[PDB]
Write an enzyme that holds these catalytic residues in place. Structure first.
Site, short mmCIF file in Angstrom:
data_model
loop_
_atom_site.label_atom_id
_atom_site.label_comp_id
_atom_site.label_asym_id
_atom_site.label_seq_id
_atom_site.Cartn_x
_atom_site.Cartn_y
_atom_site.Cartn_z
N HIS A 1 21.66 48.27 20.24
CA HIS A 1 21.16 49.54 20.76
C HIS A 1 22.24 50.22 21.60
CE1 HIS A 1 17.85 52.40 21.56
NE2 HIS A 1 18.53 52.61 22.67
N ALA A 2 22.58 51.46 21.24
CA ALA A 2 23.70 52.19 21.85
C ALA A 2 23.59 52.30 23.37
CB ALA A 2 23.83 53.57 21.22
N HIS B 1 25.63 62.01 22.55
CA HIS B 1 24.69 61.61 23.59
C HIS B 1 25.34 60.60 24.54
CE1 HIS B 1 20.83 60.42 25.46
NE2 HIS B 1 21.36 59.21 25.44
N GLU B 2 25.93 59.55 23.98
CA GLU B 2 26.55 58.49 24.77
C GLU B 2 27.76 58.98 25.56
OE1 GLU B 2 25.06 55.80 25.35
OE2 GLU B 2 23.55 56.14 23.80
N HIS C 1 26.82 60.53 28.86
CA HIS C 1 26.72 59.57 29.96
C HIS C 1 28.10 59.32 30.56
CE1 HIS C 1 22.51 58.67 29.46
NE2 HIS C 1 22.67 58.18 28.24
N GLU D 1 20.30 61.60 30.77
CA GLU D 1 19.97 61.60 29.34
C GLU D 1 20.18 62.96 28.66
OE1 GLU D 1 19.64 58.84 27.92
OE2 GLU D 1 19.51 57.67 29.76
N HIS E 1 13.46 49.64 24.49
CA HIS E 1 13.32 49.92 25.92
C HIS E 1 12.19 49.15 26.59
CE1 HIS E 1 15.52 53.23 24.11
NE2 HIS E 1 15.99 53.55 25.30
N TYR F 1 13.57 60.18 29.18
CA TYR F 1 13.79 60.85 27.90
C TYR F 1 12.86 62.04 27.71
CZ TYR F 1 16.52 56.67 26.95
OH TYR F 1 17.43 55.65 27.03
C1 LIG Z 1 20.62 56.01 22.19
C2 LIG Z 1 20.06 56.26 23.60
C3 LIG Z 1 20.57 55.26 24.64
S1 LIG Z 1 20.51 55.84 26.33
C4 LIG Z 1 18.53 56.12 23.51
O1 LIG Z 1 18.01 54.99 23.74
N1 LIG Z 1 17.74 57.17 23.20
C5 LIG Z 1 18.14 58.59 22.89
C6 LIG Z 1 16.90 59.32 22.55
C7 LIG Z 1 15.72 58.42 22.83
C8 LIG Z 1 16.24 57.03 23.07
C9 LIG Z 1 15.87 56.09 21.90
O2 LIG Z 1 16.63 55.86 20.99
O3 LIG Z 1 14.69 55.56 21.94
ZN LIG Z 2 21.09 57.80 26.95
#
Ligand SMILES: C[C@H](CS)C(=O)N1CCC[C@H]1C(=O)O
Ligand SMILES: [Zn+2]
Ligand SMILES: *[C@@H]1O[C@H](CO)[C@@H](O[C@@H]2O[C@H](CO)[C@@H](O[C@@H]3O[C@H](CO[C@H]4O[C@H](CO)[C@@H](O)[C@H](O)[C@@H]4O)[C@@H](O)[C@H](O[C@H]4O[C@H](CO[C@@H]5O[C@H](CO)[C@@H](O)[C@H](O)[C@@H]5O)[C@@H](O)[C@H](O)[C@@H]4O)[C@@H]3O)[C@H](O)[C@H]2NC(C)=O)[C@H](O)[C@H]1NC(C)=O
Ligand SMILES: *[C@@H]1O[C@H](CO)[C@@H](O)[C@H](O)[C@H]1NC(C)=O
Ligand SMILES: *[C@@H]1O[C@H](CO)[C@@H](O)[C@H](O)[C@H]1NC(C)=O
Length: 598
Positions: free
Chosen positions: A321-322, A351-352, A355, A379, A481, A491
């Site tokens: 997970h990024a 997105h990354e 950060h 975010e 998460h 988010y």
């Molecule tokens: C890739 C990023 C890492 S901060 C993320 O978890 N996001 C970005 C949008 C929503 C959420 C997800 O994938 O559940």
């Molecule tokens: Zn993020």
């Protein structure tokens, strides 16, 4: 006396901040090593260092009582001291904190180690979520195949960690109460420094909810035409495995089958990226170019030397997970992303990098201020750029979109596509924390925990599992998460405020004028705009030095979180969609799901 003490306090804070940065650097390195390389040895090392830092935080919180900080003249000094009193999990007794750490790594490592068997080949059992299962979910239009992978994943990523999750809720609650919050819900909400924050979000969500209902209705209609009424009912919640995402959080992967005008262009640059020989390295280099083009900060050498931008090819387990990482020195910032060459992944890269840019912009702040103005701000940064990157305008510039005619119908296709990512996500994001808040607050009996999850997904999103679930299953931790204990409200906040940022950045860039038909909000590209960059620098450089309304004020003079901007962006879609649903007599709303047995 107070005048002399406040001078001493200022000196005390300067030294302590520097010490906290250095101690946190050590914890971060061990956490990075574990996320990059999951082993029992790395787990032990991560958790032992965390325990050591927690012990130090306790001493710090105790030491703040030696200062009359609430009596001080300086708002800045008082704010720093307040940040130091907030211990979080570190408030737990030594043994309780150690048990919580072991519980958290047990859940994150379970999620990261999930492997399923191939649908067509029951001897090949090494398919991971990223990229194997996710490729199927996003591309397969075989509903029985989709349902197979859904059940296998949720059983392994979700149900398998029920007992651990139960203990986590218990210790999270104990920690919150040692900090004198009612529950972990209040602990998380404290980051937004606003006692009406929940009500504010309820109000904004209520304004956008009718638009979501129209999108839901139209998508369901189009899915019936594809799969038939045996798979999708007119009046029921949408079977979630058909939505192109494991958690149905974004529906853009099924745009090819639900797009308003199928004979007109639909932007999907993945094939062109491959054609031009794109690499993860190239994608990150292009993101860097976007930031530098706005007169923002170039990625330092440590980033290129130390980041992981491709899934490792040895046998190791890791968290794919990024994630973006701040090591609290100077210029030591990193990304770990299992990058793939696709359109959606190009957005994730931006997105990354958002950060990373925030880390670089506030690295000169004292340690306690080296974080987002609120979690939603962090975010939002990269998503503002992603909104520009996604435009036909920008994608044509970089030669990824060819022979594109932006007529009225193509515009509706693009707006719909964006909405499948941006509007659809809102109820999803709200439910992730509404669920956990309800468990933290002790509002749901343990016997009802799983169906409480699906009840919320039904009520807000109008989606349901492909198969009947019960309290024998436990599905929430199948979302990264939730297994990894990352607050999700950030988010929801991001998806609202990013349109406030985008709209203002576009006005500043001369790229949006509501009275000029040639400058629509949905085709704004902020690339190369130093004016938009100036606003970002002004806001991001503040870190958490001031309450978030002051950070918003520095950007565009506003102080209020508002749904005005997102509604403004999608207004042309709303008008078209409401009319299209009436034209096609589309049913709106859903009956209560039958897919979770109490
Ligand atoms: C890739 C990023 C890492 S901060 C993320 O978890 N996001 C970005 C949008 C929503 C959420 C997800 O994938 O559940
Ligand atoms: Zn993020
Ligand atoms: C979460 O909330 C908790 C309360 O629900 C809170 O816990 C309380 O923290 C208090 C410290 O702020 C603490 O108060 C002390 O009490 C001592 C005696 O208490 C005992 O008996 C109680 C029964 O009555 C038991 O329940 C307790 O368990 C204790 O065993 C006092 O001896 C102590 O006093 C000293 O300190 C005061 C404070 O001085 C302040 O600072 C300066 C000092 O220079 C002063 O000039 C200034 O005026 C100010 O008052 C001195 O005035 C005094 O001279 C003594 O030196 C103190 O009052 C309390 O016991 C504790 N628990 C409870 C149940 O009340 C947590 O701290 C909160 N947690 C967080 C993270 O915020
Ligand atoms: C993973 O960690 C192990 C020990 O836990 C270490 O020996 C090994 O070098 C690491 N693997 C990689 C590829 O870094
Ligand atoms: C670029 O940013 C610097 C500060 O980093 C600022 O002083 C300068 O005015 C900016 N240049 C332009 C052209 O906006």
């Amino acid at each position: 006396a107070l005048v002399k003490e406040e001078i001493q306090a200022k000196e005390y804070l300067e030294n302590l901040n520097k010490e906290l940065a250095k101690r946190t650097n050590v914890e971060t390195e061990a956490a990075w090593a574990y996320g990059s390389n999951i082993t029992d040895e790395n787990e032990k090392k991560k958790n032992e260092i965390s325990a050591e830092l927690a012990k130090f935080m306790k001493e710090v919180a105790s030491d703040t009582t030696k200062f009359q900080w609430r009596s001080y003249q300086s708002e800045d000094l008082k704010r720093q001291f307040k940040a130091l009193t907030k211990l979080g999990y570190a408030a737990l007794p030594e043994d309780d904190y150690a048990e919580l750490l072991d519980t958290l790594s047990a859940m994150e490592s379970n999620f990261a180690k999930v492997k399923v068997c191939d649908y067509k080949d029951s001897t090949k059992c090494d398919l991971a979520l990223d990229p194997e299962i996710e490729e199927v979910i996003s591309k397969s239009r075989d509903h029985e195949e989709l349902a197979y992978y859904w059940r296998e994943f949720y059983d392994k990523a979700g149900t398998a960690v029920r007992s651990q999750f139960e203990r986590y809720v218990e210790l999270n609650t104990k920690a919150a109460k040692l900090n004198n919050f009612t529950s972990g819900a209040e602990a998380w909400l404290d980051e937004y420094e606003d006692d009406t924050f929940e009500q504010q979000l309820e109000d904004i969500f209520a304004d956008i909810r009718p638009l979501y209902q129209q999108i839901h209705g139209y998508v369901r209609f189009r899915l019936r035409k594809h799969y038939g009424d045996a798979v999708v009912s007119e009046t029921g919640p949408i079977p979630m495995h058909l939505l192109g995402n494991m958690w149905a959080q974004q529906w853009s992967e099924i745009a090819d089958i639900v797009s308003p005008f199928p004979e007109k262009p639909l932007v999907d640059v993945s094939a062109e990226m491959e054609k031009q020989g794109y690499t993860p390295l190239k994608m990150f280099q292009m993101g860097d170019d976007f930031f530098t083009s706005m007169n923002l900060t170039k990625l330092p050498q440590d980033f290129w030397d130390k980041s992981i931008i491709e899934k490792p090819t040895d046998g190791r387990d890791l968290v794919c997970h990024a994630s973006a990482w701040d090591f609290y020195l100077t210029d030591d910032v990193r990304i770990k992303q299992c990058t793939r060459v696709t359109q959606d992944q190009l957005f994730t890269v931006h997105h990354e990098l958002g950060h990373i840019q925030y880390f670089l912009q506030y690295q000169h702040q004292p340690f306690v201020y080296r974080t987002g103005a609120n979690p939603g701000f962090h975010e939002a940064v990269g998503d503002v750029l992603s909104l520009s990157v996604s435009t036909p305008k920008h994608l044509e510039k970089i030669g990824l979109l060819k022979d594109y005619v932006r007529d009225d119908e193509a515009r509706i296709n693009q707006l719909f596509l964006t909405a499948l990512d941006k509007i659809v996500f809102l109820p999803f994001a709200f439910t992730m924390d509404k669920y956990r808040w309800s468990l933290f607050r002790g509002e749901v009996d343990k016997a009802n925990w799983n169906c409480a999850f699906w009840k919320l997904r039904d009520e807000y999103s109008g989606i349901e599992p492909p198969v009947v679930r019960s309290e024998k299953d436990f599905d929430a931790p199948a979302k990264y998460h939730i297994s990894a204990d990352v607050e999700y409200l950030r988010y929801l906040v991001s998806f609202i405020i990013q349109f406030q940022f985008y709209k203002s950045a576009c006005i500043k860039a001369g790229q949006y004028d509501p009275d000029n038909v040639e400058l629509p909000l949905d085709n704004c590209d902020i690339y190369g705009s130093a004016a938009a960059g100036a606003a970002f620098h002004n806001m991001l450089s503040m870190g958490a030095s001031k309450p978030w309304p002051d950070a918003l004020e520095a950007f565009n003079g506003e102080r209020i979180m508002s749904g005005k901007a997102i509604a403004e962006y999608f207004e042309p879609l709303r008008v078209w969609l409401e009319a299209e649903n009436i034209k096609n007599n589309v049913h709106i709303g859903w009956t209560t799901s039958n897919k979770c047995v109490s």
